[PDB]
Amino acid sequence: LIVTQTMKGLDIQKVAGTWYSLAMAASDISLL
Amino acid sequence: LIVTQTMKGLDIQKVAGTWYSLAMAASDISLL
Amino acid sequence: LIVTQTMKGLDIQKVAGTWYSLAMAASDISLL
Amino acid sequence: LIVTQTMKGLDIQKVAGTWYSLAMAASDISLL
Amino acid sequence: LIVTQTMKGLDIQKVAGTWYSLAMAASDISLL
Amino acid sequence: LIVTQTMKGLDIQKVAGTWYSLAMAASDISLL
DSSP states (O other), X not given: OEXXXXXXXXXXXXXXXXXXXXEEEEEEEEEO | XXXXXXXXXXXXXXXXXXXXXXXXXXXXXXXX | OEEEEEEEEEEEEOOOBOXXXXXXXXXXXXXX | OEEXXXXXXXXXXXXXXXXXXXXXXXXXXXXX | OEEEEEEEEEEEEOOOBOOOXXXXXXXXXXXX | OEEEEEEEEEEEEXXXXXXXXXXXXXXXXXXX
């Protein structure tokens, strides 16, 4: 598979917590 | 499969919690 | 698989917590 | 964009004229 | 962009004229 | 860009004229 993730002009503030990521791509994605 | 995820001009504030990601793409997606 | 993750013009502030990463890509992604 | 304008403890007196505003924020600001 | 404008303890007197504002923030600022 | 403008304990008097603002921040600033 071909994966293209593009982000332009983002403004993020006050992100208290377990922020994992913004763009995450792979073969198998299992989150418990 | 071909996956294209584009984001422009985002403004995110006060995101307390387990924010995983914004654009996530893969073969298998299983979330418990 | 081919993975391309592009980020331009990001502004991040006050990110208290366990911020893992912004763009994360691999074969297997398992998060507990 | 994220805009935060805070004012505490202001004392204004004798303001003869075309007083527009105190805190003004927007995308485009053109004043002739 | 992230903009934070804070004002505490201001005392303004005798402001005859075209007083526009105190804290003004936006994307484009053109004043003629 | 991240912009923080802080003002504490200001005393302004007799401000005859075209007083625009105190703290002004944005992307493009063109004044003629």
